[PDB]
C-alpha cells in the first residue's frame, strides 16, 4: 500500500522463504519497482515487478536447447500439462480453464526457451493456478499415452478394427503442419537456421513435420530431466499481490525438493563468418491468385548479443529508421522500385536469438531481378553511411517509443515477461531493458556527442560485416504433394519395422488411449472457484454526451490514460451507393496514407508519426441487439496522441477530411499491391475466420456485408485491383466515397482522456467538427435511441449454403454457422453457456484430442450467430459429423450441473476481462449497450439452468429448425466434390 511503494521497503540481503533480495530498482516511467531475488539452494532467478495492477501475472521460463527438429521442447510443453504428481488426473490445464477466472492461461515454445505464463485478478485463483503450474512443470507425470496424443502416434483409422491401415496422428504433428502452411513462416524458419547454423538455432524448435515421429517417449523424458530443473529456470511475477505469498508457495511446493546443479544448456556465441553465403529454398504455391512474379529474396546481417542491452536498443532503433515507413531508405529503394509487392518476412530487428539479426528484402519479384535487389541493398547502405539520418525522423521514432511507454494496456505483465525473455534466457539483465528512460537519455547523448554515430554503426554492421546471408525462395507447385510422398514413405518404413508383438501393443495402447479420451473421469484433485466467486454486478462506466457543431453527439469518458488522448469517430454509410461498398475497405486503408493539403504522402507520414500514435480508418458492421436483420454500417476513424500534441492530431483529421490527395497514383499502386500481398499471406493463420465469415454470409445482412468487407471476396477483389494495368478507374472511385463519408452529416464521436485534459479536448474536437462539410439509399431506416440510424432489411431471407475453397494446404479449416437469436433475447444467454459447454465437454475431445486438430469448438456472436469451427484440422467430413453429434449430445442433456457451472466460469472469464482506459466505454459507443442491458444479460447468464439448455438446444440447433451455413478451406476432397449440395470456389 501502495505496491511499488512497499517493494522499496525490501532490504538487500533480506531472506524470504529460501530467497535472497539481490537488487531493488525503481522504474518510475513504468510505475513499478523491480526486485531481483535468487533461490539460495537451487540458484533459481526471480524477478518481481511490483505495480498497483490487479491483473497479476506469473510466468516460469526454462532454457530449452534442442539439437534436432523433432519438436521435443514443444511436445514436452504440451505434455507436462497432461498430468502431474499432485494432480494425476487427465488434462489439468484444459480442466482449469473452466475452474478459474483467469485473464490468460497458456504456454509458448520459442527457439531456445519455453514459457508458462498465466494471469488473473483473483488472488485465490492465483494460488490455485500457481500450484498447478509449478507441479506440471517440475513434477509431470509423463505418461506414454499423453505423449501419443499431444505429440505423434501410430493409429488405425478405426482404433477398434486392427485390419485398417495405420496412420500418423497427433496435435503438435498437425499444429506444425499448419504452421508451415504459411510461406512466410517457412522463409522465416530457414533464415534463422542458415544464418545461425552452429547450435540450437540450426533446428526447428517447434517441430519439422517429417522429423517429429523420430521422437521417442524416452527422449521426451530425458529432455525434461535435463532442462526443467529450477537451476535452469527464471521466475517472474507482476502486480499488486504480496510477493511473500508467491515465494512461500514456489519454495514449499517445488523448489525445496531440489539442490543446485550446473545446467548443460548454454547456447554458445555464433562464430562470425569470414565470407557471405547464399541459399535457395522452395515453398508452396499461392492461395489462390497468380505466374512468374513470386520469388522472395532477403539479405540478413548478424548483430551482437542482445545481452549488450544498450547496443541492442540502439540497433533496434536504427533498424526502425532503416525500414519503417515511406521515409525509410529501404522503403524508397526496394518498395518504391516496383520490383516486388512488399518487404520480405522478418524485416528489421530480430532479437529472439542470442545474437540478434537484421533482415531486409522483397517478395513478389521475378527471379531474374535478384541481383538487382542485392545491388540496391548494397547501394542503399553506401548512401546511409555517407548521408545518415535526418533529425526529425529520429525525433519521430523517439516520440513513438514515448507513446508505447506511456500507453496503458490490460496485459502489461504479459508483454513485459515476453519482452525480457530472450535477454534473460542468456543470463542478461532484464531490469536494464526496463530503464527505457536511461536508454533514451543515453541515446540522445550519444547523438549530441557524435553527429556520425549512427553512420559508423551502419558501417560496422552492414558495410563491413562479412556475416551476410542472401536467401531466395521460389514456390513449388507440388510442394505439399511432395511432402506427403516422403511422409507416406516414413510411415511405411515405420510400419515395416513393427514386430507382431509391436503391432498388438499399438492396437491395445491405441484402444487404451481412445478409452482414456471417452471415459468420464474425476477432477476433484484440482482446485476450483465457484459461481459464488463471480461478482454479481459490474462497475458502472461514467459518461457524459455533449451535442456539438451543432447536433453531433460527442462522448467523453474520463480515464487514467497517463497523459494520452484517444479520439474516435463513426461516420455512417447509409448515403453511400451500393456499387462502391466493396471499395470502402480499400478507401479506408489509403485515406491516411495518400497525403493531405500541402503534405505529400512522405510529408504526411512524417507528421502522423511525430504528432500522433497513429491515425486509421476501418469499415465496420455493427449488428443490432434485438433484430437479426438490422445493423449499423459505417467507418470508424481512430487516432491517438500525447496530451501536448492534441491540436496537431485534430488538425491532421481536419485536413484529411477537407483536402485528401486522391491524385497520388504511383504510391497508390504500392499500397494496393502491399495490402493484397499481406491479405493473401494471412489466410492460413486466420483460415477458420475466413471459413466462418463465408459460412455466415447467407444468414444475416450483416454477415453478407462482413463478407464484402473482410471475406475472401475482399481478398480476391484486392488481388484483382493489384493485377490491374490501368489503376485509374479504381482511383476515381475514392472521391465519390469521400463525398459521402468525410463530412458531419451522419456522425458521432468519442473521447477518452484524463479528467485534467478533458476541457482542452472539448475545444479541439469542436473545432474539428466545425471544419467539415454539412448538408439514404435503402428501405428502411430505423431510429433507435442520441440517435443511431440503422439499415433494416425485413425481407431478408436466409438461405442454406456450403462452400469449399480449394487451397493447396496440408490441413483444413471448417466452419458451420447457425442463425439463432440476438443479444436481448433471454435464450441468447443460454446459447452462450451452451457454446462453451459444448466446446469444453465435446468438441475439444472429438476434434482435437481424438482427431488431432489443433483447435475446435463453438462460439456465439453478438449477432446471434452460433458457429462451430475447426482449426488446422486433418479431417473434414468427420469434423462435420462431430458437429452433428455435438448438438445431439446437447439435446440428450447428458451433462451435469457442475459442467454448467464450469461453463459459466469460462464465460464470465471472457466478458469480465479487464478493459483498458482507452476502450471504456466503446461498447456504448459502438453497439449501444447500456449498463442496464449488460446487467440484465449478466443475470440471465446466472439464471441459466439445465432445462433451459435442453430447451434451447432443441429449439435452435436441431436439423431443419434453423438455417445453417457451411464453409471449408483445404485441399480437394472427392467426397465433397460428388456432393451437388457443395459449391467449389
Amino acid at each position: 500500500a501502495a505496491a511499488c511503494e512497499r517493494a522499496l521497503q525490501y532490504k538487500l540481503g533480506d531472506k524470504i522463504h529460501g530467497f535472497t533480495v539481490n537488487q531493488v530498482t525503481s522504474v518510475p516511467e513504468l510505475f513499478l519497482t523491480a526486485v531481483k531475488l535468487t533461490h539460495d539452494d537451487t540458484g533459481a532467478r526471480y524477478l518481481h515487478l511490483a505495480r498497483e495492477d490487479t491483473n497479476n501475472l506469473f510466468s516460469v521460463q526454462f532454457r530449452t536447447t534442442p539439437m534436432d527438429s523433432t519438436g521435443v521442447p514443444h511436445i514436452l510443453q504440451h505434455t507436462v500439462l497432461c498430468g502431474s504428481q499432485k494432480y494425476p488426473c487427465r488434462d489439468p490445464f484444459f480442466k482449469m480453464l473452466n475452474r478459474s477466472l483467469s485473464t490468460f492461461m497458456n504456454a509458448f515454445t520459442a527457439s531456445d526457451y519455453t514459457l508458462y505464463p498465466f494471469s488473473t485478478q483473483n488472488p485465490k485463483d492465483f494460488q490455485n493456478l500457481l500450484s498447478v503450474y509449478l507441479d506440471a512443470t517440475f513434477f509431470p507425470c509423463l505418461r506414454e499415452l499423453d505423449f501419443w496424443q499431444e505429440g505423434w502416434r501410430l493409429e488405425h483409422e478405426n482404433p477398434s478394427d486392427p485390419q485398417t491401415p495405420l496412420v500418423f496422428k497427433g496435435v503438435v504433428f498437425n499444429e506444425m503442419k499448419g504452421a508451415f502452411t504459411d510461406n512466410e513462416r517457412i522463409f522465416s524458419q530457414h533464415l534463422q537456421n542458415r544464418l545461425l547454423p552452429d547450435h540450437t538455432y540450426s533446428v526447428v524448435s517447434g517441430g519439422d513435420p517429417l522429423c517429429i515421429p523420430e521422437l521417442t517417449w524416452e527422449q521426451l523424458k530425458q529432455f525434461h530431466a535435463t532442462h526443467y530443473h529450477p537451476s535452469n529456470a527464471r521466475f517472474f511475477t507482476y502486480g499488486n499481490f504480496p510477493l511473500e505469498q508467491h515465494l512461500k508457495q514456489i519454495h514449499e511446493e517445488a523448489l525445496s525438493k531440489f539442490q543446485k546443479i550446473e545446467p548443460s544448456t548454454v547456447v554458445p556465441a555464433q562464430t562470425p563468418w569470414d565470407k557471405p553465403r547464399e541459399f535457395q529454398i522452395t515453398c508452396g504455391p499461392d492461395s489462390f491468385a497468380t505466374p512468374s512474379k513470386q520469388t522472395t529474396v532477403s539479405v540478413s546481417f548478424l548483430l551482437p548479443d542482445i545481452t549488450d542491452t544498450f547496443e541492442a536498443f540502439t540497433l533496434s532503433l536504427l533498424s526502425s529508421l532503416l525500414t519503417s515507413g515511406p521515409n525509410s531508405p529501404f522503403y524508397k529503394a526496394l518498395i518504391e522500385s516496383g520490383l516486388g509487392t512488399d518487404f520480405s518476412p522478418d524485416v528489421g530487428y530480430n532479437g529472439y536469438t542470442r545474437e540478434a539479426y537484421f533482415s531486409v528484402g522483397l517478395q513478389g519479384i521475378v527471379e531474374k531481378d535478384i541481383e538487382t535487389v542485392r545491388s540496391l541493398i548494397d547501394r542503399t547502405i553506401d548512401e546511409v553511411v555517407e548521408k545518415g539520418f535526418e533529425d526529425d525522423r529520429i525525433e519521430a521514432l523517439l516520440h513513438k517509443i514515448e507513446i508505447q511507454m506511456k500507453h496503458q494496456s490490460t496485459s502489461f505483465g504479459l508483454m513485459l515477461t515476453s519482452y525480457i525473455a530472450s535477454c534473460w534466457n542468456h543470463d542478461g539483465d532484464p531490469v536494464e531493458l526496463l530503464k527505457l528512460g536511461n536508454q533514451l537519455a543515453k541515446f540522445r547523448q550519444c547523438l549530441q556527442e557524435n553527429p556520425k554515430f549512427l553512420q559508423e554503426k551502419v558501417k560496422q554492421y552492414f558495410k563491413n560485416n562479412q556475416h551476410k546471408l542472401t536467401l531466395s525462395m521460389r514456390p513449388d507447385d507440388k510442394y505439399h504433394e511432395k511432402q506427403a510422398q516422403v511422409e507416406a514413405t516414413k510411415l511405411k518404413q515405420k510400419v515395416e519395422a513393427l514386430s507382431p508383438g509391436d503391432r498388438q501393443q499399438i492396437y491395445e495402447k491405441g484402444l487404451e488411449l481412445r478409452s482414456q479420451q471417452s471415459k468420464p473421469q474425476d477432477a476433484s484433485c484440482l482446485p476450483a472457484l465457484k459461481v459464488s466467486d463471480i461478482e454479481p454486478t459490474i462497475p458502472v462506466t461514467e459518461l457524459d454526451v455533449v451535442l456539438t457543431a451543432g447536433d453531433i453527439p460527442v462522448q467523453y469518458c474520463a480515464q487514467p490514460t497517463n497523459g494520452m488522448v484517444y479520439f474516435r469517430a463513426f461516420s455512417s454509410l447509409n448515403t453511400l451507393p451500393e456499387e462502391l461498398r466493396p471499395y470502402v475497405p480499400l478507401f479506408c486503408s489509403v485515406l491516411t496514407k495518400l497525403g493531405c493539403g500541402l503534405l505529400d504522402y512522405r510529408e504526411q507520414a512524417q507528421q502522423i508519426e511525430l504528432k500522433t500514435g497513429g491515425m486509421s480508418a476501418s469499415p465496420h458492421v455493427l449488428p443490432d441487439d434485438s433484430h437479426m436483420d438490422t445493423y449499423e454500417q459505417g467507418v470508424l476513424f481512430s487516432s491517438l496522441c500525447l496530451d501536448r500534441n492534441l491540436p496537431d492530431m485534430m488538425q491532421l483529421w481536419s485536413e484529411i477530411f477537407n483536402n485528401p490527395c486522391f491524385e497520388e497514383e504511383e504510391h497508390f499502386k504500392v499500397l494496393v499491391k502491399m495490402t493484397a500481398q499481406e491479405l493473401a499471406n494471412g489466410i492460413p493463420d486466420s483460415g477458420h475466420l475466413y471459413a466462418s465469415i463465408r459460412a455466415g454470409r447467407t444468414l444475416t445482412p450483416a454477415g453478407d456485408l462482413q463478407e464484402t468487407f473482410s471475406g475472401m471476396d475482399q481478398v480476391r477483389l484486392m488481388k484483382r485491383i493489384a493485377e490491374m494495368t490501368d489503376i485509374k478507374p479504381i482511383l476515381r472511385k475514392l472521391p465519390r466515397i469521400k463525398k459521402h463519408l468525410l463530412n458531419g452529416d451522419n456522425m458521432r464521436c468519442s473521447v477518452n482522456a484524463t479528467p485534467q485534459q478533458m476541457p482542452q479536448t472539448e475545444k479541439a474536437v469542436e473545432d474539428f467538427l466545425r471544419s467539415i462539410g454539412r448538408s439514404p439509399v435503402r428501405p428502411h431506416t430505423v431510429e433507435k435511441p442520441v440517435i443511431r440510424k440503422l439499415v433494416m432489411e425485413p425481407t431478408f431471407k436466409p438461405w442454406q449454403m456450403k462452400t469449399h475453397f480449394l487451397m493447396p494446404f496440408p490441413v483444413n479449416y471448417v466452419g458451420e454457422c447457425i442463425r439463432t437469436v440476438p443479444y436481448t433475447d433471454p435464450d441468447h444467454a443460454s446459447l452462450k453457456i451452451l457454446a462453451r459447454l459444448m466446446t469444453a465437454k465435446f468438441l475439444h475431445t472429438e476434434i482435437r484430442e481424438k482427431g488431432g486438430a489443433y483447435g475446435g469448438g463453438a462460439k456465439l456472436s453478438h449477432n446471434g450467430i452460433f458457429t462451430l469451427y475447426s482449426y488446422r484440422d486433418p479431417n473434414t467430413i468427420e469434423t462435420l459429423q462431430s458437429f452433428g453429434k455435438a448438438v445431439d449430445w446437447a439435446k440428450s442433456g447428458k451433462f451435469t450441473q457442475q459442467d454448467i457451472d464450469e461453463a459459466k466460469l469460462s464465460v464470465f472469464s471472457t466478458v469480465d476481462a479487464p478493459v483498458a482506459p482507452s476502450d471504456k466505454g466503446m461498447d456504448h459507443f459502438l453497439y449501444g449497450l447500456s449498463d442496464e442491458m449488460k446487467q440484465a444479460h449478466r443475470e440471465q447468464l446466472f439464471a441459466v439452468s439445465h432445462d433451459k439448455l435442453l430447451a434451447v438446444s432443441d429449439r435452435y440447433l436441431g436439423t431443419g429448425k434453423s438455417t445453417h451455413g457451411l464453409a471449408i478451406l483445404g485441399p480437394e476432397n472427392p467426397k465433397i466434390a460428388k456432393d451437388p449440395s457443395w459449391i467449389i470456389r
Binding site: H74, S102, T103, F104, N106, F108, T109, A179, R185, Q189
Partner: peptide, 9 residues
C-alpha cells in the same frame, strides 16, 4: 480466460 491452444514455431 484465455488463449486456449498453446504455440509456437
Amino acid at each position: 480466460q484465455k488463449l486456449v491452444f498453446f504455440a509456437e514455431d
